Amino acid sequence: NSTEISELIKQRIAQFNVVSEAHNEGTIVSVSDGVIRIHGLADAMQGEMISLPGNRYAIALNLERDSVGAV
Amino acid sequence: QLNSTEISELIKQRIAQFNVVSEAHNEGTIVSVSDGVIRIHGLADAMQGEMISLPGNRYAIALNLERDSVGAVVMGPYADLAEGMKVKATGRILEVPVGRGLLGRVVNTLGAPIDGKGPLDHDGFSAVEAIAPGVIERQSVDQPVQTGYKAVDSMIPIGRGQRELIIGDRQTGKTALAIDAIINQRDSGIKAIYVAIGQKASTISNVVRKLEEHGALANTIVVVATASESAALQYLAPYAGAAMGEYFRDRGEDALIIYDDLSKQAVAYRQISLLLRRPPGREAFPGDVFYLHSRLLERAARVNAEYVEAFTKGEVKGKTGSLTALPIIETQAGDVSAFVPTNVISITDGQIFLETNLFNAGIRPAVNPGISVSRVGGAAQTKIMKKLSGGIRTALAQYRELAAFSQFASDLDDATRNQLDHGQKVTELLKQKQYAPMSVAQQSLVLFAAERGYLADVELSKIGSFEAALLAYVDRDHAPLMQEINQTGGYNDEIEGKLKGILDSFKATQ
Amino acid sequence: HHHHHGMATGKIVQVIGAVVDVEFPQDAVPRVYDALEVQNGNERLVLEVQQQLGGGIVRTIAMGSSDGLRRGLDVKDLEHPIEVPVGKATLGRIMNVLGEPVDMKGEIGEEERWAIHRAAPSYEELSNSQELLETGIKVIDLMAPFAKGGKVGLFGGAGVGKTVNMMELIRNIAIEHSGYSVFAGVGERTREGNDFYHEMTDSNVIDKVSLVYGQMNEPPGNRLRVALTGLTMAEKFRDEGRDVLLFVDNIYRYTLAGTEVSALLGRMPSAVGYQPTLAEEMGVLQERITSTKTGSITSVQAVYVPADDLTDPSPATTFAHLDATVVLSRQIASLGIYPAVDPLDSTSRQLDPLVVGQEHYDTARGVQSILQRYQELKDIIAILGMDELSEEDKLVVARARKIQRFLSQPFFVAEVFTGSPGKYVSLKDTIRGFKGIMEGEYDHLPEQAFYMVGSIEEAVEKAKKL
Amino acid sequence: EFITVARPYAKAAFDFAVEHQSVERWQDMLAFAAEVTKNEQMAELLSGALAPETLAESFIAVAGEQLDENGQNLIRVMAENGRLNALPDVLEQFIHLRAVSEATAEVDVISAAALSEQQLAKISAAMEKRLSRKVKLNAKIDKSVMAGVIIRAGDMVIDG
Amino acid sequence: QAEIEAERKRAREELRKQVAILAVAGAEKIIERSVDEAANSDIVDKLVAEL
Amino acid sequence: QAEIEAERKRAREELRKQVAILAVAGAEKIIERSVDEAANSDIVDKLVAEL
Numbered sequence A: 001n002s003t004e005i006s007e008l009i010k011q012r013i014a015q016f017n018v019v020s021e022a023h024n025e026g027t028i029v030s031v032s033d034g035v036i037r038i039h040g041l042a043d044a045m046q047g048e049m050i051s052l053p054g055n056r057y058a059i060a061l062n063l064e065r066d067s068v069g070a071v
Numbered sequence B: 001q002l003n004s005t006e007i008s009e010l011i012k013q014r015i016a017q018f019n020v021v022s023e024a025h026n027e028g029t030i031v032s033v034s035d036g037v038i039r040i041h042g043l044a045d046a047m048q049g050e051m052i053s054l055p056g057n058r059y060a061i062a063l064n065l066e067r068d069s070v071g072a073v074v075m076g077p078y079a080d081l082a083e084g085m086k087v088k089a090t091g092r093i094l095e096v097p098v099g100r101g102l103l104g105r106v107v108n109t110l111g112a113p114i115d116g117k118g119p120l121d122h123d124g125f126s127a128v129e130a131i132a133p134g135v136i137e138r139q140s141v142d143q144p145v146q147t148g149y150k151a152v153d154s155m156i157p158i159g160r161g162q163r164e165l166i167i168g169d170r171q172t173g174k175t176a177l178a179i180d181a182i183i184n185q186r187d188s189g190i191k192a193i194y195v196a197i198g199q200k201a202s203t204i205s206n207v208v209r210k211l212e213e214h215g216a217l218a219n220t221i222v223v224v225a226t227a228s229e230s231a232a233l234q235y236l237a238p239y240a241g242a243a244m245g246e247y248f249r250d251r252g253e254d255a256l257i258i259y260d261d262l263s264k265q266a267v268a269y270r271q272i273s274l275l276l277r278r279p280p281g282r283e284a285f286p287g288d289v290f291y292l293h294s295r296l297l298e299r300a301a302r303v304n305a306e307y308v309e310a311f312t313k314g315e316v317k318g319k320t321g322s323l324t325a326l327p328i329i330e331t332q333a334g335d336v337s338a339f340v341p342t343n344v345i346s347i348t349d350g351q352i353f354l355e356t357n358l359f360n361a362g363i364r365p366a367v368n369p370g371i372s373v374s375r376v377g378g379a380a381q382t383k384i385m386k387k388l389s390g391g392i393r394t395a396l397a398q399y400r401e402l403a404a405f406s407q408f409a410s411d412l413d414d415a416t417r418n419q420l421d422h423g424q425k426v427t428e429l430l431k432q433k434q435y436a437p438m439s440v441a442q443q444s445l446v447l448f449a450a451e452r453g454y455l456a457d458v459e460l461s462k463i464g465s466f467e468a469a470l471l472a473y474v475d476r477d478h479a480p481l482m483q484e485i486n487q488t489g490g491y492n493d494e495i496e497g498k499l500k501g502i503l504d505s506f507k508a509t510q
Numbered sequence C: 001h002h003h004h005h006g007m008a009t010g011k012i013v014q015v016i017g018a019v020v021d022v023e024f025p026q027d028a029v030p031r032v033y034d035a036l037e038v039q040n041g042n043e044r045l046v047l048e049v050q051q052q053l054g055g056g057i058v059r060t061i062a063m064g065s066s067d068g069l070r071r072g073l074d075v076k077d078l079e080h081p082i083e084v085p086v087g088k089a090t091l092g093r094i095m096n097v098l099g100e101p102v103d104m105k106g107e108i109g110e111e112e113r114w115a116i117h118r119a120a121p122s123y124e125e126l127s128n129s130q131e132l133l134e135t136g137i138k139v140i141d142l143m144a145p146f147a148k149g150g151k152v153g154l155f156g157g158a159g160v161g162k163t164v165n166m167m168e169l170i171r172n173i174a175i176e177h178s179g180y181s182v183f184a185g186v187g188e189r190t191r192e193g194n195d196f197y198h199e200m201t202d203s204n205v206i207d208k209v210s211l212v213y214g215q216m217n218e219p220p221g222n223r224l225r226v227a228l229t230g231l232t233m234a235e236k237f238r239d240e241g242r243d244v245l246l247f248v249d250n251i252y253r254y255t256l257a258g259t260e261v262s263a264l265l266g267r268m269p270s271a272v273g274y275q276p277t278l279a280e281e282m283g284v285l286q287e288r289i290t291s292t293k294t295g296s297i298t299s300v301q302a303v304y305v306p307a308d309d310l311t312d313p314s315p316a317t318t319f320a321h322l323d324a325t326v327v328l329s330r331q332i333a334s335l336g337i338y339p340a341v342d343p344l345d346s347t348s349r350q351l352d353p354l355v356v357g358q359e360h361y362d363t364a365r366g367v368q369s370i371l372q373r374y375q376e377l378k379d380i381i382a383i384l385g386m387d388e389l390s391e392e393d394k395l396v397v398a399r400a401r402k403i404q405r406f407l408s409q410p411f412f413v414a415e416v417f418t419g420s421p422g423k424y425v426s427l428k429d430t431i432r433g434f435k436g437i438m439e440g441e442y443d444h445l446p447e448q449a450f451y452m453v454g455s456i457e458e459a460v461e462k463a464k465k466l
Numbered sequence D: 001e002f003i004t005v006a007r008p009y010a011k012a013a014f015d016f017a018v019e020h021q022s023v024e025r026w027q028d029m030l031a032f033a034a035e036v037t038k039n040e041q042m043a044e045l046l047s048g049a050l051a052p053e054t055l056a057e058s059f060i061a062v063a064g065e066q067l068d069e070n071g072q073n074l075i076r077v078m079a080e081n082g083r084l085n086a087l088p089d090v091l092e093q094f095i096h097l098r099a100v101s102e103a104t105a106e107v108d109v110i111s112a113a114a115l116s117e118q119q120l121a122k123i124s125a126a127m128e129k130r131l132s133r134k135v136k137l138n139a140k141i142d143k144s145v146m147a148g149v150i151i152r153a154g155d156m157v158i159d160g
Numbered sequence E, F: 001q002a003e004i005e006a007e008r009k010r011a012r013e014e015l016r017k018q019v020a021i022l023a024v025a026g027a028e029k030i031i032e033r034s035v036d037e038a039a040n041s042d043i044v045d046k047l048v049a050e051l
């Protein structure tokens, strides 16, 4: 989950204090079959359909806090 | 005195002496033992499933490798012992003697002559489970049997390589009927096997009484597994049989086996699985039974010479591995909804329903015909047995068809009356006892009623049983040629003359 | 192979099961399909990633078994799954279920390491169209129409001469049809499979179709594998324009196969744990089989009976996968006729009334009236003395004797078997010769004259022989 | 105690720490931290605390904050994670970090303990026993060794 | 079937006589292999006095 | 009836293997003396030699 980083926990050494990545694009966190835990896209809009890379606006309905799961 | 020299011999044996070794473990720490399920650590990566001979001998075969995490088990008494105890590791699972030596030899399920036999007749060591022979390594043997019912053969003859389900009835004999089977088999004095788990010592004992009562008692062997036989071990025996079963099948001899109480292996895998805290299939046991009885159910190999390596490999032995499988099918109500009974049911090369009804209302042979359906069939019925075997389903129809007439009170017709003469009276013909052998020179005895006038002749069940037995007399009177008959076992009208004049002796035999 | 040069991966994390609890080169993950080929002890291991899951830790599975190895590992990643030598060269040559040279090296012709993934065409691509089919079976292709490049539900019990008629299919699909005639099977009896090699000599025409077999003990993935590579094959035949028509063994093996599949997933499977998408796999399936542009992508549709299920979401799907319904008559086998099977329940769907219009709405639909004619003529007129029955009912019994005898006809199979030559038949000689003759014309044509005799020149000129 | 969360830790320890060379430096900082939780009032008070901010606060604060800022803002990282609950996991995994990095060792059989760092087998080992000198094996000296070969021997007395 | 039993019993009884008889030899070879597996040195001075 | 005495042999001789078992049991005691009697830390230096 969180500990997975250890590289962004390597960051988080500072980057738990260091911060501020909020963007409409943070990484797809976990890719299996169009279900990806995913990052950034902080506040994103309703099921916000996110025009996907080479792919349709991708929708994530209720905000999965850590890594939004996607469709 | 006598065995003192043995000490020297032992001293001779112990002459091999000893050394300390393995300065670095070479051992684990059996982290948390819980009821033989040990959270366990140390000496981690290895042969998966390695039976690791722990204190005592206990060789814990645990194929469960979590990354880094151990837990392990072997059948036995883990209650007093404590966790953490350094893992004493035998390298893997083992092999008990691999050979055909046993004949009818007796033992624990380990082969431990729990008979007190002490007897080991098998070569070397045999690990348990194995696959079937390939194309023309298994190839159909038609070798028939008439098993102690004339109808035994009559319904469905067979040959080596075959597995047919027979549904079974609790407390009906369908173990004791299932027992009543072996008559011709002990008589067969031919290669077969049988297995049992959770067994009952009384049934064991008296069973043995029958074993001696069974003439052979050595014609085939079985190891024994009792009410404490591990759910593991329960799963194990089916694996076990192949071990030296090769020393027939590989010997190119017919291997043949019998497995029963397979449910014990299943819910064995259940209390395993729930014990494993592992989500199983329904009934708390994993669905491996497919694979478990894929791997398990595969083996049956009818004699075929692409077993060209079987036994001597091939020092020919270029030859025909015969493996005939003996199923045991029973359930309360005989429930097929069991995914086991479902898929398993599919694998069956025959499916016999046993009717509790006949022996229920008491008719000694109880079974459910045509509800009993086996694919092998009277192909193995020899030319006459091939010949005369036809009319069965007929009265299964006809008699039962005749039965339908009752449905309207007073509906019958003289023709139909003849369909209860053949249907019901010829129904009165057949029987098989609580203990029934079958002669198969009795094959003739069968072909009489049509062949002889025995349809009419001695039509009285009084005279059928009686006067027919008096025809067994007429054999006492005249049974010279039956030598050449059971010798023959085939349809030749030349005989059939002797069949008519036989029926004359039946007049003489009443 | 693909890459998997480099051994990739890493450990098998928790060593349980063929699916991978495994450290791959953790950054390394392929397409879940995209294979990973390790060394399995001695063996070279391989798993197409069962899961796509990170850290080089994802399920990656195989039809085999894992006991004995270390959790530690490294597993080369075969960048391609699915690519295996494939094409039409295999024809007749024995492929393992691996395609491996099944026989003494069966050497199904090594061809494109070819992706299994060949699949549905564009609306137009394989035929936006309809393509009808018949090979001219003596009494049969006449009896039922068919649509080219497809599969149709087969219901019949025993005594088919399915191998015989297969020789008629050799005599057709190989002979009386050119389009590349391929077939495959799985889950048989060992030396009885070898006896289908005996039969493979009976037809002898085995060369049309690579020998690739399952031998049902094959594990569930093993059991369920061969198809899409089969599409790397029709990726020759139909794609080769020599219309792919390949005979299709086993549904129960496939139905139950997908059951064991989604079971192994532990997933919410289909109902009763079956493969949830197995039907969608049928959409991919008929999606594969079309009378194509390329060449008609056709398949012999016969099912390992998924227990011959009742209402059978399989037959439910196999209905509408049956352009023609099917039955085989032990009774016409009891009639034993060269037409030995059940014409009852066997005809194309739309043939008679329309789509042949009268052509079968007259010859064949009116012919079905004749099925009523010997149906109640033979049957009803059989009930009691048929003296009541107009001799038409007894010329519906010469529809039986005479005409139904004409149905009994030599077979291109029986040529390839008993020598009884048979043909690609002309239903004109049915639609006329057997329709007019069987009905009103030359009703003096003997049964025997007609019996075992082909179209109304063989039956009715055998009525010149009478 | 999962130590796997702490695996990602000791990961980031050799990683960011040794990257910062805090593998030693926050071997020191880390040392002081295990000293902090080692404080049993600090255990007695360990978790009542809802705000993990309160925790890293009174933690670096209480203890004296010898943690790095990599370990102060990381103190936000694990403290916030609350995975900070288990101190020693990645402490012995960091001992395994630098040490595994440095690994050379030994184990005394039939002997009082050895642990002579041997980069190779028999390297410092046969050099130690040969080097013995010691040669006594005192703990496991005789009854253990002589019961080792004689252990195999009684194993032959299995003949009884 | 009845009779043979008693005899068999006597046989085992003799096995008990010769058994106790064998106790001697077991003490003997007992110390013997003791020195053998001693495999370090043999002091037969120490008397185990095994039966 | 004969087979009975046969078991009297399997069991008679079996017990011979028993008193065997106890036999090198008490022998094993004698070997405990064989560590007691005539053991040497020199021999321990022979294990040290086994290094």
Ligand SMILES: Nc1ncnc2c1ncn2[C@@H]1O[C@H](COP(=O)(O)OP(=O)(O)OP(=O)(O)O)[C@@H](O)[C@H]1O
Residues within 6 Å of the ligand: B168, B169, B170, B171, B172, B173, B174, B175, B176, B177, B178, B180, B330, B359, B362, B363, B364, B365, B366, B432, B433, B434, B435
């Ligand atoms: N052919 C037979 N005819 C009449 N009785 C039979 C026959 N076979 C067995 N029995 C009777 O069955 C009784 C023993 O019942 P048993 O427990 O074997 O029933 P069961 O059918 O075996 O139940 P299960 O099959 O579940 O063990 C015996 O008294 C025996 O006489």
